[PDB]
Amino acid sequence: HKNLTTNQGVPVGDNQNSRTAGHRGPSFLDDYHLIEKLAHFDRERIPERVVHARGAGAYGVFEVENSMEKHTRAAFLSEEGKQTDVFVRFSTVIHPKGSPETLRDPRGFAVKFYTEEGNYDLVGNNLPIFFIRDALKFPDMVHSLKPDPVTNIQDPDRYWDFMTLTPESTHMLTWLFSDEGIPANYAEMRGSGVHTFRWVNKYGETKYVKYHWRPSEGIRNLSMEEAAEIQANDFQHATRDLYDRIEKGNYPAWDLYVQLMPLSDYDELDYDPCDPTKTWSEEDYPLQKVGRMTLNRNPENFFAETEQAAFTPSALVPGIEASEDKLLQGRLFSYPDTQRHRLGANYMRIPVNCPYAPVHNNQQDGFMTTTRPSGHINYEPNRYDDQPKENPHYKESEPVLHGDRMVRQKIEKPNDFKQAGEKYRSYSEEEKQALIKNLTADLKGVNEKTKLLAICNFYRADEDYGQRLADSLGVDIRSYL
Amino acid sequence: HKNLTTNQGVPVGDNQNSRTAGHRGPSFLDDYHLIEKLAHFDRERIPERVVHARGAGAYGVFEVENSMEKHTRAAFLSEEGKQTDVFVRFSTVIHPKGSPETLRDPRGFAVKFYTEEGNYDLVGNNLPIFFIRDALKFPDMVHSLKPDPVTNIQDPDRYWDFMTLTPESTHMLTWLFSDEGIPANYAEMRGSGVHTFRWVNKYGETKYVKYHWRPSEGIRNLSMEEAAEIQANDFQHATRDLYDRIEKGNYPAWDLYVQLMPLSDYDELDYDPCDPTKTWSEEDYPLQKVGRMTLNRNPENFFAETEQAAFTPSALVPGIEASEDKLLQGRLFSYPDTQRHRLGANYMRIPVNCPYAPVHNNQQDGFMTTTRPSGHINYEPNRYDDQPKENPHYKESEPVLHGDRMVRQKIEKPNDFKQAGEKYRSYSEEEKQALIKNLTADLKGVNEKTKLLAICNFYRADEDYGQRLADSLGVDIRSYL
Amino acid sequence: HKNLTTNQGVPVGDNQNSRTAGHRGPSFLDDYHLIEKLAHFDRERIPERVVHARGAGAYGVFEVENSMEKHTRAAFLSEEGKQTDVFVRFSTVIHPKGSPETLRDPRGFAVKFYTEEGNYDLVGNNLPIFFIRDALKFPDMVHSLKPDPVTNIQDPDRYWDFMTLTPESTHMLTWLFSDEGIPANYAEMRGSGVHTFRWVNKYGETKYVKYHWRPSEGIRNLSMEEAAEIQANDFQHATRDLYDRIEKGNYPAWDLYVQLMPLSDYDELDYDPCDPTKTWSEEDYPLQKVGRMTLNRNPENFFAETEQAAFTPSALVPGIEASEDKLLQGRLFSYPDTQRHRLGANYMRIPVNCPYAPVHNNQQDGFMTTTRPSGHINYEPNRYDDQPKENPHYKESEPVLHGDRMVRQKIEKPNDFKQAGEKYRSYSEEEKQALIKNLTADLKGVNEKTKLLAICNFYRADEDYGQRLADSLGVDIRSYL
Amino acid sequence: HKNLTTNQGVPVGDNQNSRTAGHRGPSFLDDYHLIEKLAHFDRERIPERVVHARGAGAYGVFEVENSMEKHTRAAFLSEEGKQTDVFVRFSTVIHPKGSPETLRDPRGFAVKFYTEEGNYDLVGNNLPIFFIRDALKFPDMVHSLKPDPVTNIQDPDRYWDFMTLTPESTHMLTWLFSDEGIPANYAEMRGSGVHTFRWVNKYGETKYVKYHWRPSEGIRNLSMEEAAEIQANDFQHATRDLYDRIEKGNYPAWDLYVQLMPLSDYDELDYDPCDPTKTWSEEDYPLQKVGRMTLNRNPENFFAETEQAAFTPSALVPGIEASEDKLLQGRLFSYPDTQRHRLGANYMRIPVNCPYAPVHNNQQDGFMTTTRPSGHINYEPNRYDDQPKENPHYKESEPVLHGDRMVRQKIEKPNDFKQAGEKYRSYSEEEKQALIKNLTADLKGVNEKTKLLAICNFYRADEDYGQRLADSLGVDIRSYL
Ligand code: HEM
Ligand code: HEM
Ligand SMILES: COc1ccccc1O
Ligand SMILES: COc1ccccc1O
Ligand SMILES: COc1ccccc1O
Ligand SMILES: [Cl-]
Ligand SMILES: [Cl-]
Ligand SMILES: [Cl-]
Ligand SMILES: [Cl-]
Ligand SMILES: [Cl-]
Ligand SMILES: [Cl-]
Ligand code: NA
Ligand code: NA
């Protein structure tokens, strides 16, 4: 048994009735419990994430099967058997909190590893590529895909306008409009790092790496019809599924694989290996097994742990570095930037975001300082040998720059259509039919000029792809061939 | 033709490429356009409303048919033909911003009248009563109805626990579980002030008043099955429907009626006329036509106008005053309170919230001061005849207090069951079948003890109601009768 | 030895140099440590208190000498020898952080008692009365006294405009323009609760109470000349003094006394005993010793503990209640209100604000949720016996209301001038001279009409006081006499 | 004559009395005017600037005397006679908003030019160099100089610890401990850009440029004793002086001069021309007159204009670019960053901050959206020829990068002591005496080892400097010599 109390620790005598002039009269201002309780209610909500607002979290463990020390000095990957606690959030992308989990979208796949050398965030999606290759375009891309700013309804005429005029999107669209654009749930779903990262070993040698998560539960996707049926009865089916699996003891798991490429292979390829619109051939750069992640624990409070969770691709640990990918480069900034807004200057003290590794630095103050700070010395250099010092063992590498000037210029070898054509041709006939069906339903009402340009981009990827789409939309494209 | 610019008004040379070390190198910190564009994008979102997060807005006009000067000095009601501009937001209640408009819930019906004596907000719902009668219970009621704080899914076991232990909810539930708990859209929907207010005329005479909005399009509802069919294909059907009606010139309208009651009828009744769990008899207190509101204009920007709209029941105008309704009394506080959090201290300067009537006072400063203030004098009293002064013509009435002590006590004659029974009996057989169906689907999984208490509360309302529900749920209630 | 780390727990390899293109080139965006460090630095500051911005804090203990159980059931006062931890903040009033502590002003004297029945804040000042008697005037009073909104300099012509037109200020100004308007430091200074409160014993019997703190170090003040001498060399002399006393083991202390008055004495006094412009006679209501507060510990971190401290007069504990004082009644609302803005919705979880008594309630979420919440049940009533419940032993009293209407009306017996005259006459000749000197220096540059009305108010208090001031200012008052 | 109104535009009937239970009872919650008025009062304050919190603003005009088109394509400098409106804020640095203007500190000298090609901020100080040369050290430097985080008093032992271990500070300290560390006021004060910037002309040719403002009122400094004598009687003397000059029509003015250096002079020098701890010789790089700025208009409201003013060194206009100065590079980020926190995401819409040039871009939403946005198209590229487009005529230059790796490394030729010695020797004997006097008063109580290292740094600058200081401090340095 417990007393209901105010926030001052005073027990509440009556949690039913406001304080009033007799039994039916108007209310008094001197009702601290009423005002405190309403005022805190009135302040429950914080801004939702600007994208990936709808999602679900769980905790688990990552266990290494094969040490990666030949390629990275990352502590959490150093030894067979080594276990690292994770927190993972899965999500949709475009619509707000409360939106259905039956909509076409990439799905987020964000993993926070609580390592002995700091938190490592691998902030992935299910699909292995992206629509754009420079962060400068992200707000434009997002705005195009978001509900129209007048109507509050998503409009394919808007996002296809953007995408058609951004032909580097063609590969991504060739995946997103497969039925893998609507995963069945968060467990039966792929995971990808998307970007090339740099792995640096004990000798200082660097390789490029890509990360892949393969679900133990296999990949299951929904057709448009299957998605509609689920939407009719449950707008939160994936959130429900994840919680329920774990509550029943049916823990979902993913194997982690990497591809590795020498830096020197840039020069021989017909694409830029750090263009995130590109994959790497699994023939030429085979998947290498790293380990397994198992999610086995629901959070205790959805708001405090899942809603407040903060991931950033710049949360890198020794041995794992950013590549020069210009999309990634902007992410390094945007995540901690948004999070200071969404969660507060001290968001890294919120429990789910705290490292297991010790934190010692000269930062101070900010809204909601809860950490009981002490001491006179908040500056370095200082004369005190016991105060925190820099540690040169933990310097990052020094990537070689191939450019000579500060420029705003597209990467060389953009090669916008080739891989989209390869993906198309890798599709089974059924999968090619689903792709065309899903494209057609999406494009059939868009502006004719934008429609034609979409067809043209897909035709440039593969003639049979473009032509099939034209046939299905009833567009004759002979005069242009 | 126009230049794309920074916020400093500098034209942007390249909105495609970040600034980098050659065409494929990493990105530079000296890229003001990138950082400004991403930093603003990173800050687009503000907290959603704590309830009624999902909604849609329109502008229109209200026109008086019958002047109401005999009963209220309210300027906007003073002459036949008098037109007042309005802004209206409709909404659901419980789920977040992107949630479906096919869920069971009261619907919000919030009308802002831009009058010559200030803005008047009549913050209504479709249903004419409420679940509770004291604001002190609102955060509890809401928390019970909201998604579970661990799972992020609404749980009938939690809200029926609260409602069954809060038997004054029995009338509301008798309406909410009719098919009117899912209006077909926002146009074919009832509107109600819910609370009793006080109207005061120019002689200082007071009457109790209730407000009712009657849709020109008629009232139409959805069965559970009809709602699921809509949900399968559109999770923003009501938002879509409202925008489309107005865009095509098919403007939805409502007629405004009032009921009027003398304060001296309190002892005539077997309920408290200011208990918002109660309606008033239309036989004994007939509906009196006031005028008609037509919605004829969509907003230009959903975020700036609909999302940032701020209504409060305390935005009262001379001649229209609060009643003593303890639920209403807390609303007077909570709305401006939550708005200062959600929107900023200066939220009343956001265009949609601005009065048409002049504003002049001694308030100053606060985040985002955009109004070009001037002058030395920001205090009253002062020696300057030209500075703003109080105007005693605009004093509010002085309601008589019947109580002689500051108390926390339930009203007398709560009468929790009788009107629920009267409503039940007023239903057609088809409507009674829908009600029992809807209740049964909602109750069939809840804790048995809570299920029995639900049945008991409805049985106390009407024996046939309670027994039918018991029969439909398979609960034998013989031992209690 | 300790590593300097990022907030992610990664050790820092170089805390001297930004990451750049060669040893002298421009900076890269991929410098997480730079950006994290700068971004936190960029967010150190929170809004200063709207008043009392300049101040200093210490911890200590309060020990009861005489148990007060005959007059209040307050747990912390229930037994001889009972010790309660305190946190105290002293302050000036009008000027910002960084302003000198040699300015004329009331001094704040805010004491937070960490009791077994919750936190109790007694938010006092040194001087025992106030300028105004209704909270509606507070922002006007403050705006008049604050630096002019154009010039950013305080202007006596502004505040004397307000004060002269607010004659209830006359008693306060007769204290504030004694040399007690500049205490020598925070230790050699009076403390006062200012308002009448209600004390309620275990039989439910109520008395009016006033609180007084008497410094063990004596009361010492500064002339205008002595203040200027200090100001030349130290603008934080009182903060310095407090810290230095405690660091040296010279702990300052104050004895707590109360005056007690029966509620029934209202009716035969020639002033309202709950008018905070009035004191109570120490002959007719003698001071009764309660106990002693000793300050013996400096905070570990000024920002986290002193700057973020939050006191409210509405933080009352069982047995101690507000009176009807209309000034106090607004304070009940304003403090938690401003603190939610200044510090966050969860400001009551900042360590210095946390009670020692357990907190258990159904509030949730809000910015910077750091408390590791758990459980499914965040609403009451609920079916669970183990969840927090109200406790009727802790209900507040039910004060009798003497009025029968909701009114806006000044109190009866305002008696604006009599106690100002009594205070004047109680001064020594030297003290009278200082008063007239201090007033003259303040008034000599104000608008002539305002200057005359000041003189008139002081003359109404005492004809010698007013005539001496008129003579000292060179104002001929013959035509009025 | 005007009515006092609420923010809803309703005239206030009584601005003196709260609404209460009779004339002397407690206050009612239903008092919208009370609550709105207090709640706005409660939210007046915003965070002060993290440095340069104390300051004062004025408006004026900058007129070109000599067109600079041969060296920069900057539009505001393109023609003799061309006039540009400015806003200027002057400041101290370390202490908070209300702190005295008599303290030793650089003084801020921030100029916003409202040009036809966007706002250009030149965010200078009076002194022409800085303490440090890499932004990564700025939070350390500041934290050392700021009041101790326990005591809230500045401690020379803390900042001398930092500075002695940061010997690049030696030049700066040799200026700051001259009497120029305390300017007499803001009019009789130097101004400096401090950094090297890049000027780029219409042919794309780049020169390095340094900016200097020369007061029409001449330079006047205060001794420590003169500063104390002013501090005794006025803590806002420089704010007062500036307002009062302009109010009287005695408008202060500064002539703007530049020095210009070819990029190729790098190897001609024994320092780095982009090391902000260095000046350039006026013999070798003579001052060239550009024009004159006159301040002639005080602001209408100090909060709205001066307090909410936002300047950033990254507010550059075509033809003026950042240099590679690593201090400046961090500033490019930190200002807008801090401003988003201090003022809100939309701070660029606060009137003082708004450009005169048109702003058109695809940014949207954020707290306090007041600008009446409209339209469907908030993304680029898009198919609409009338929507804003990039303009290649306004591309920035492409500076050449000399380094071939991403490094963290000190510049070559840091040369920490030579220019400090040159400055020392340039001082008159009276100025040298003041310097030694000021240093000795500052150093006499610091840790002996720190004190000796200070002496050593100054001795390395000039033997006579160091020896005189050692003598004055009573430190025997024979035996290090
Ligand atoms: C320039 C490109 C991108 C930018 C600028 C960007 C920016 C952001 C921002 C600001 C957030 C909100 C973070 C928060 O509020 O905590 C977010 C969320 C997210 N983004 Fe990105 N994003 C980009 C591309 C991508 C890519 C390529 C992926 C995956 C590879 C991705 C995956 C995610 C995920 C999974 C989340 C949700 C994190 C969570 O669960 O809390 N984004 N993004
Ligand atoms: C209606 C009249 C008054 C109002 C509306 C008012 C309002 C406020 C507010 C809003 C603050 C800032 C609190 C914070 O941010 O934590 C404050 C501080 C303060 N007020 Fe008042 N006040 C009033 C009268 C008085 C009176 C009568 C006293 C003493 C009896 C007083 C003593 C103080 C003190 C000591 C502080 C500083 C507390 C601290 O150390 O943080 N005030 N006041
Ligand atoms: C007030 O909202 C609700 C009522 C009944 C069932 C579901 C809800 O979301
Ligand atoms: C950065 O300015 C300072 C230098 C020396 C002493 C005090 C200061 O605030
Ligand atoms: C050249 O060495 C020194 C000079 C002055 C003070 C201390 C030293 O170590
Ligand atoms: Cl640090
Ligand atoms: Cl707030
Ligand atoms: Cl006002
Ligand atoms: Cl609660
Ligand atoms: Cl921010
Ligand atoms: Cl843009
Ligand atoms: Na009429
Ligand atoms: Na006793």
Short mmCIF file of N, CA, C and O in Angstrom, two decimals, chain A residues 291-345:
data_model
loop_
_atom_site.label_atom_id
_atom_site.label_comp_id
_atom_site.label_asym_id
_atom_site.label_seq_id
_atom_site.Cartn_x
_atom_site.Cartn_y
_atom_site.Cartn_z
N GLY A 291 28.13 -12.21 -36.50
CA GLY A 291 27.53 -12.60 -35.27
C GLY A 291 26.04 -12.60 -35.33
O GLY A 291 25.47 -12.54 -36.42
N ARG A 292 25.41 -12.63 -34.17
CA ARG A 292 23.94 -12.71 -34.08
C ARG A 292 23.42 -11.77 -32.99
O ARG A 292 23.96 -11.72 -31.88
N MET A 293 22.33 -11.08 -33.30
CA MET A 293 21.64 -10.28 -32.34
C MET A 293 20.29 -10.89 -32.01
O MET A 293 19.53 -11.24 -32.94
N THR A 294 19.97 -10.96 -30.73
CA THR A 294 18.68 -11.53 -30.29
C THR A 294 18.00 -10.50 -29.45
O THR A 294 18.60 -10.01 -28.53
N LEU A 295 16.74 -10.17 -29.76
CA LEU A 295 15.97 -9.22 -28.95
C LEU A 295 15.06 -9.94 -27.97
O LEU A 295 14.21 -10.74 -28.40
N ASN A 296 15.27 -9.70 -26.67
CA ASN A 296 14.66 -10.55 -25.65
C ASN A 296 13.97 -9.85 -24.52
O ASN A 296 13.64 -10.49 -23.50
N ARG A 297 13.82 -8.52 -24.61
CA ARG A 297 13.34 -7.76 -23.47
C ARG A 297 12.57 -6.55 -23.96
O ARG A 297 13.15 -5.71 -24.63
N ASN A 298 11.28 -6.43 -23.55
CA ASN A 298 10.57 -5.22 -23.80
C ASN A 298 10.97 -4.12 -22.87
O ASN A 298 11.37 -4.38 -21.70
N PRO A 299 10.78 -2.84 -23.28
CA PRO A 299 11.03 -1.78 -22.31
C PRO A 299 10.06 -1.74 -21.18
O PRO A 299 8.95 -2.27 -21.30
N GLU A 300 10.43 -1.09 -20.10
CA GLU A 300 9.48 -0.89 -18.99
C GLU A 300 8.48 0.26 -19.24
O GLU A 300 7.39 0.19 -18.77
N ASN A 301 8.88 1.27 -20.03
CA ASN A 301 8.01 2.47 -20.29
C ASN A 301 8.29 2.95 -21.67
O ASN A 301 9.46 3.25 -22.01
N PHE A 302 7.26 2.94 -22.49
CA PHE A 302 7.43 3.25 -23.94
C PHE A 302 7.96 4.68 -24.12
O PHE A 302 8.95 4.94 -24.84
N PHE A 303 7.36 5.63 -23.44
CA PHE A 303 7.87 7.02 -23.57
C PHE A 303 9.31 7.24 -23.14
O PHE A 303 10.10 7.85 -23.87
N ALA A 304 9.67 6.74 -21.95
CA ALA A 304 10.97 7.10 -21.39
C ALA A 304 12.08 6.45 -22.18
O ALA A 304 13.18 7.00 -22.17
N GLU A 305 11.80 5.24 -22.75
CA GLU A 305 12.85 4.38 -23.37
C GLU A 305 12.74 4.38 -24.86
O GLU A 305 13.69 4.80 -25.53
N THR A 306 11.58 4.10 -25.42
CA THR A 306 11.51 4.06 -26.87
C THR A 306 11.33 5.49 -27.47
O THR A 306 12.06 5.89 -28.38
N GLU A 307 10.39 6.24 -26.94
CA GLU A 307 10.13 7.57 -27.54
C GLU A 307 11.32 8.49 -27.37
O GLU A 307 11.64 9.25 -28.29
N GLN A 308 12.01 8.45 -26.22
CA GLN A 308 13.15 9.28 -25.95
C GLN A 308 14.48 8.77 -26.47
O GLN A 308 15.51 9.40 -26.26
N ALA A 309 14.51 7.57 -27.05
CA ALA A 309 15.77 6.98 -27.56
C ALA A 309 16.39 7.88 -28.65
O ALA A 309 15.70 8.37 -29.52
N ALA A 310 17.69 8.06 -28.58
CA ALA A 310 18.38 8.89 -29.53
C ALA A 310 19.56 8.11 -30.14
O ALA A 310 20.44 7.65 -29.40
N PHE A 311 19.54 7.93 -31.46
CA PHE A 311 20.62 7.27 -32.21
C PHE A 311 21.26 8.25 -33.13
O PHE A 311 20.57 9.16 -33.63
N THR A 312 22.56 8.11 -33.39
CA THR A 312 23.21 8.93 -34.40
C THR A 312 24.31 8.17 -35.16
O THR A 312 25.08 7.45 -34.54
N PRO A 313 24.33 8.26 -36.50
CA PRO A 313 25.41 7.60 -37.20
C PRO A 313 26.79 8.09 -36.81
O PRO A 313 27.82 7.38 -37.07
N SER A 314 26.87 9.29 -36.22
CA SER A 314 28.21 9.76 -35.71
C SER A 314 28.61 9.23 -34.36
O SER A 314 29.68 9.56 -33.86
N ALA A 315 27.78 8.37 -33.78
CA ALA A 315 28.17 7.64 -32.55
C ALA A 315 28.99 6.42 -33.01
O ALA A 315 28.55 5.27 -33.01
N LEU A 316 30.24 6.71 -33.33
CA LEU A 316 31.21 5.74 -33.83
C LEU A 316 32.18 5.41 -32.71
O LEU A 316 32.34 6.19 -31.77
N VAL A 317 32.74 4.21 -32.77
CA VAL A 317 33.71 3.75 -31.74
C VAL A 317 35.06 3.52 -32.42
O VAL A 317 35.11 3.32 -33.64
N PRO A 318 36.14 3.43 -31.61
CA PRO A 318 37.41 3.20 -32.25
C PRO A 318 37.41 1.98 -33.15
O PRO A 318 37.04 0.89 -32.74
N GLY A 319 37.97 2.18 -34.37
CA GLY A 319 38.03 1.15 -35.36
C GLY A 319 36.94 1.21 -36.40
O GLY A 319 36.96 0.47 -37.40
N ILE A 320 35.93 2.08 -36.16
CA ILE A 320 34.82 2.22 -37.09
C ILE A 320 34.63 3.70 -37.32
O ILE A 320 34.37 4.44 -36.35
N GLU A 321 34.72 4.11 -38.60
CA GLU A 321 34.72 5.51 -38.96
C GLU A 321 33.74 5.75 -40.10
O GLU A 321 33.31 4.81 -40.81
N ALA A 322 33.42 7.01 -40.32
CA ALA A 322 32.56 7.42 -41.45
C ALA A 322 33.33 7.23 -42.72
O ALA A 322 34.58 7.30 -42.73
N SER A 323 32.63 6.94 -43.80
CA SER A 323 33.21 7.16 -45.09
C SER A 323 32.85 8.59 -45.55
O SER A 323 32.06 9.30 -44.92
N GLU A 324 33.40 8.92 -46.69
CA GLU A 324 33.19 10.19 -47.38
C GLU A 324 31.80 10.34 -48.02
O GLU A 324 31.53 11.41 -48.53
N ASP A 325 30.92 9.33 -47.96
CA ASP A 325 29.57 9.37 -48.48
C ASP A 325 28.89 10.66 -48.04
O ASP A 325 28.82 10.94 -46.83
N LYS A 326 28.47 11.50 -48.98
CA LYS A 326 28.02 12.88 -48.65
C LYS A 326 26.63 12.87 -48.01
O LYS A 326 26.24 13.85 -47.39
N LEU A 327 25.90 11.78 -48.17
CA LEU A 327 24.64 11.57 -47.48
C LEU A 327 24.92 11.31 -46.00
O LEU A 327 24.41 12.00 -45.12
N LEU A 328 25.85 10.36 -45.77
CA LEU A 328 26.28 10.05 -44.40
C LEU A 328 26.83 11.28 -43.73
O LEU A 328 26.52 11.55 -42.54
N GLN A 329 27.64 12.04 -44.44
CA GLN A 329 28.32 13.17 -43.79
C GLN A 329 27.28 14.14 -43.13
O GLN A 329 27.51 14.65 -42.07
N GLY A 330 26.19 14.41 -43.82
CA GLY A 330 25.15 15.27 -43.27
C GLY A 330 24.41 14.67 -42.09
O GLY A 330 24.05 15.38 -41.10
N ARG A 331 24.21 13.34 -42.10
CA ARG A 331 23.65 12.62 -40.96
C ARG A 331 24.47 12.77 -39.71
O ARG A 331 23.95 12.85 -38.59
N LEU A 332 25.78 12.87 -39.86
CA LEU A 332 26.62 12.96 -38.68
C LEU A 332 26.22 14.16 -37.85
O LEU A 332 26.33 14.15 -36.61
N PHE A 333 25.84 15.23 -38.54
CA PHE A 333 25.35 16.44 -37.90
C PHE A 333 23.87 16.42 -37.45
O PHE A 333 23.55 16.82 -36.34
N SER A 334 22.98 16.01 -38.35
CA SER A 334 21.55 16.19 -38.17
C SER A 334 20.95 15.45 -36.98
O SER A 334 20.03 15.95 -36.34
N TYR A 335 21.48 14.25 -36.66
CA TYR A 335 20.85 13.49 -35.57
C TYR A 335 21.05 14.11 -34.17
O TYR A 335 20.07 14.41 -33.49
N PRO A 336 22.31 14.37 -33.79
CA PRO A 336 22.47 15.06 -32.47
C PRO A 336 21.90 16.47 -32.45
O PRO A 336 21.25 16.88 -31.43
N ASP A 337 21.87 17.13 -33.62
CA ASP A 337 21.26 18.40 -33.77
C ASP A 337 19.73 18.36 -33.46
O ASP A 337 19.20 19.16 -32.67
N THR A 338 19.03 17.45 -34.13
CA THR A 338 17.58 17.33 -33.91
C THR A 338 17.29 16.92 -32.46
O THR A 338 16.27 17.29 -31.90
N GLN A 339 18.14 16.04 -31.94
CA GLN A 339 17.90 15.46 -30.63
C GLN A 339 18.01 16.47 -29.51
O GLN A 339 17.25 16.46 -28.57
N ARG A 340 18.94 17.38 -29.65
CA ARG A 340 19.03 18.52 -28.67
C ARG A 340 17.77 19.31 -28.65
O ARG A 340 17.33 19.73 -27.58
N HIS A 341 17.12 19.48 -29.79
CA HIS A 341 15.77 20.09 -29.88
C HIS A 341 14.65 19.24 -29.35
O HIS A 341 13.86 19.69 -28.47
N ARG A 342 14.62 17.99 -29.81
CA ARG A 342 13.49 17.08 -29.46
C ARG A 342 13.54 16.69 -27.98
O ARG A 342 12.47 16.56 -27.38
N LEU A 343 14.71 16.48 -27.44
CA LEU A 343 14.88 15.85 -26.12
C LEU A 343 15.55 16.71 -25.06
O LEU A 343 15.42 16.42 -23.88
N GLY A 344 16.24 17.77 -25.47
CA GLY A 344 16.95 18.60 -24.55
C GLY A 344 18.44 18.53 -24.71
O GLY A 344 19.00 17.53 -25.19
N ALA A 345 19.11 19.58 -24.24
CA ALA A 345 20.57 19.66 -24.36
C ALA A 345 21.27 18.46 -23.67
O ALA A 345 22.35 17.99 -24.12
#
